[PDB]
Design a protein around this ligand. Structure first.
Ligand SMILES: Nc1ncnc2c1ncn2[C@@H]1O[C@H](COP(=O)(O)OC(=O)CCCC[C@@H]2SC[C@@H]3NC(=O)N[C@@H]32)[C@@H](O)[C@H]1O
Ligand SMILES: Nc1ncnc2c1ncn2[C@@H]1O[C@H](COP(=O)(O)OC(=O)CCCC[C@@H]2SC[C@@H]3NC(=O)N[C@@H]32)[C@@H](O)[C@H]1O
Lengths: 231, 221
């Protein structure tokens, strides 16, 4: 009844009034590629390292099952598909979303969304939590708060799925393209703390964050239990 | 993200851009009570016996998984829950649908929806096909044809699921209530057709009561 016209992402959608975690359900269940798991609320939503992810009603909490047929070396870029997809959707709603490497989306430095990719071989789960009309925790914001008015959750879902499908299809053919989209939508040229501090200069051809320390030393950061903080 | 507020029916919804048949998927897949299987189009949709159900894009094609804690004798009434749910939804959109025993809903005698119930173990699958904005076979009708404008498909889904959840919850407690709702919304007092006779009513088992010209009374199951 939804009438989705996407090629892969959104071929099937499993909606829940409530769930423990869409990422957990997606990882555990036998699901086909492109299936989207979405819930009004999560009782056990999480970020990396089992960090609690607040998932009240009003937000967009979903996961997508992917089976990317690309080199093992390109798989780490899936998180960027989620981040860029969220940014594009925010821009469609006239919200200035910017990427905080490697998985966060901010609006005026406040966290509006987070991306979490979990993979176990031939199966990758792309999880996205985006605050829309829900109340948010410390250091966060939502689409409603930035626009000053409520936004139809289904409209945001449709927009995001359409963007992700396009991004994913192109990723399968040209896995390097997503890096340019990340660069054009990420927060750069400012001081950050990885510990060590320096200027976040850019991301390289592997998606590593390039940081220039005061001494001039250049470090390349691989994401994998490494968050950054803005100064 | 759908924000459904129903108690059982619609707790979970599995949507497909395309599927063979929502009833077939519901029957062969393990699904919790209340799960709704819905698809934009069905390639092998079916009615009863071996009939095909035309399921092009634009219509509402869905199945609901039930596991009703009621006596065996009440199971034949599940089809009525679907038919009445459709009638109630149509009324919300200002369309007057009438039930043609035992599973059809007609508008000015043109078929707008059909219901198909199938049992698999202790799981009951309630299938409903309702023409909304899709092309329909000759003689049939759709919400779009009756209203003269494109009808928001999701709005029809929300309405129907809300009505079905209410009808089902009441059925679990008062399984006889659905019978009066059917009677007040079914086509009776007319001749029907193997034998012919007047469709007088439905009895307490949901059987169609027919009065033949000879005066004989037959009960159709
Ligand atoms: N609703 C919210 N909005 C903004 N920040 C939040 C938030 N809830 C928690 N946080 C903060 O964000 C941190 C988590 O950051 P991380 O970088 O590790 O992790 C993330 O940013 C990833 C979050 C992924 C969420 C989605 S919801 C759909 C799917 N199902 C799941 O169970 N997860 C995914 C927490 O430690 C909090 O400080
Ligand atoms: N779209 C349509 N609208 C009106 N009449 C139709 C139609 N498609 C076919 N018909 C006619 O209706 C007859 C079928 O009537 P019956 O009384 O046997 O059967 C029915 O009326 C039941 C139809 C149940 C359909 C739903 S769709 C969701 C679920 N998944 C399935 O595969 N099935 C269920 C056919 O033989 C046709 O003549």
């Amino acid at each position: 009844m939804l009438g989705l016209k996407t090629s892969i992402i959104g071929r099937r959608v499993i909606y829940f009034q409530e769930i423990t975690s869409t990422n957990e359900f997606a990882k555990t269940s036998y699901l086909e590629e492109g299936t989207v798991i979405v819930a009004d609320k999560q009782t056990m939503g999480h970020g990396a390292l089992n960090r609690k992810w607040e998932s009240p009603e009003g937000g967009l909490w979903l996961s997508i099952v992917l089976s990317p047929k690309v080199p093992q070396k390109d798989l780490p870029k899936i998180v960027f598909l989620g981040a860029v997809g969220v940014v594009e959707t925010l821009k469609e709603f006239s919200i200035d979303g910017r990427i905080k490497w490697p998985n966060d989306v901010l609006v005026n430095y406040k966290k509006i969304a987070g991306v979490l990719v979990e993979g176990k071989g031939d199966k990758i789960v792309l999880g996205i939590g985006l605050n829309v009309n829900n109340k948010v925790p410390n250091g966060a914001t939502s689409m409603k708060l930035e626009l000053g008015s409520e936004v139809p959750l289904l409209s945001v879902f449709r927009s995001l799925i359409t963007n992700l499908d396009r991004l994913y299809l192109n990723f399968l053919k040209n896995p390097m393209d997503i890096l340019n989209l990340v660069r054009d939508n990420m927060i750069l040229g400012v001081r950050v703390k990885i510990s060590f501090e320096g200027i976040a200069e850019d991301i390289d051809d592997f998606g590593r964050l390039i940081i220039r320390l005061d001494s001039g030393e250049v470090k390349k950061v691989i994401y994998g239990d490494v968050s950054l903080r803005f100064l």
